[PDB]
Nucleic acid binder design. Sequence first.
DNA 1: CGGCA
DNA 2: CAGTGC
DNA 3: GCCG
DNA 4: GCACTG
Length: 331
Amino acid sequence: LDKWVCAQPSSQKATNHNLHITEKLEVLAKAYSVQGDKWRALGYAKAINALKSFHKPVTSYQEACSIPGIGKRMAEKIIEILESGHLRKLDHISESVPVLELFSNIWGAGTKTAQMWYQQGFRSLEDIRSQASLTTQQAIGLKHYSDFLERMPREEATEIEQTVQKAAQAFNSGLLCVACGSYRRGKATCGDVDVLITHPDGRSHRGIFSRLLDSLRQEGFLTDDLVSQEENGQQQKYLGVCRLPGPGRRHRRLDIIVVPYSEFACALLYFTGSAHFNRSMRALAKTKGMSLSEHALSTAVVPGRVLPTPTEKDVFRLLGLPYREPAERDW
DNA sequence: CGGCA
DNA sequence: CAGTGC
DNA sequence: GCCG
DNA sequence: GCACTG
Ligand SMILES: O=c1ccn([C@H]2C[C@H](O)[C@@H](COP(=O)(O)NP(=O)(O)OP(=O)(O)O)O2)c(=O)[nH]1
Ligand SMILES: [Ca+2]
Ligand SMILES: [Cl-]
Ligand SMILES: [Cl-]
Ligand SMILES: [Mg+2]
Ligand code: NA
Ligand code: NA
Ligand code: NA
């Protein structure tokens, strides 16, 4: 269990005894990430979380290797940093990385698009604005480039959640609306607001997206849509942009998901995160012959069985994990 | 060797 | 499908 | 990158 | 691990 972050409280990271290592490794991890070397970047990310939660400063190659998530190669970098105070590789990162990071911070442009723009000679957002062929999503991402990189005070996230909740409950007073993500995990600032909507009668969540989005558009609250499949009535998620009324307001990202009550615990667990907490818990489930999604915890396919999970605690229990409140899932 | 949700 | 983001 |  | 685009 020591090897699974989802089995451990994330508060272990608040006492990082190895910051002089992790701040350097994070530079490299991001360099691999924006260049598209996603699995190497994942290994770095996991190693950083292992170093952040370790109980003491690492001081030997043997100690480092013993830590789950640190191997020979990562141990060698750790030993370099301690002796020399520096990591030579940081002076030999691809010169494209700063521009790739600039470009992949456009919403809807990932590593493949950023690398293509770089190959085509683009180096600035002015080059993108004037010369690139943007998708509809990427054009919205660029228009809101700075605002999507800002985090909002959690008090503003509360206002946004309440705006959604009031619009929803206006046409069905029984709808339950909960802000998840970093808000539910108790963070002081939030990159966006992630709102989960359900109805305890098990049926009246159906079809609400059309009414809800139209309502939020009527009041001018929604300003742009990034993902919203409104054509066939099977919509599960909305990703877009909102802005509260009055002066001094920024455009803020807003995510909504609507789920049947029978899936509430698994949807709440997914949407609360964190992302690395979810990936850890889902990996653990696989080792136990199970599969965990926002819909269900289910046994391996043959057509698996859906396990009964009325509450988040039941998912933890079925995976043999001690329960963690949302604030302790911040991996 | 291959997954890594 | 590949690419993208939650 | 690391893991089984 | 899933739901989106085009
Ligand atoms: O890769 C991901 C990203 C998110 N998620 C889940 C967990 C996350 O907490 C939730 C909302 O995604 P956000 O991108 O909104 N992240 P979060 O709310 O944790 O942080 P932020 O403050 O940046 O929005 O979706 C994943 O499972 N995998
Ligand atoms: Ca979100
Ligand atoms: Cl590099
Ligand atoms: Cl619950
Ligand atoms: Mg969020
Ligand atoms: Na190790
Ligand atoms: Na992007
Ligand atoms: Na974010």
